[PDB]
Amino acid sequence: LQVDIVPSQGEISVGESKFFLCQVAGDAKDKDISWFSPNGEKLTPNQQRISVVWNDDSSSTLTIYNANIDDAGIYKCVVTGEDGSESEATVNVKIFQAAA
């Protein structure tokens, strides 16, 4: 059971947006896919500055918009199997400010 995030790392300028695509390798027929923020919360699209989309049973896309410095950290994509199998991938999201 394997999950991967594209891109594998990211930097977002303050106020800007970036997406990360989590994909399961293989059949995710009976598998659940969830994104978690650095503070541990399971992420849902109603949240401020956050979008989570489940494209199909094998991939889920996280989008961070209007990026705040408080949004930086290790985000995690977890895939959970019917059989109790489980794996995760992590992406380190850095937030920065620079001359614009």
Written in H, E and C, the secondary structure of 33-46 is EEEECCCCCECCCC
Give resolution in angstroms. 1.9
The Cα 77–Cα 87 span in angstroms is: 8
The structure was resolved experimentally with: X-ray
The Cα 18–Cα 13 span in angstroms is: 9
Give the fold, CATH level 3, of 1-100.
Answer: Immunoglobulin-like (2.60.40)
The Cα 50–Cα 95 span in angstroms is: 14
Residue 30 tokens, joined: 């009976």
Q: In what order do the strands lie in the sheet with 18-25?
A: 2-6, 18-25, 59-64, 50-56
Give, as one character, the DSSP assignment of residue 85: -
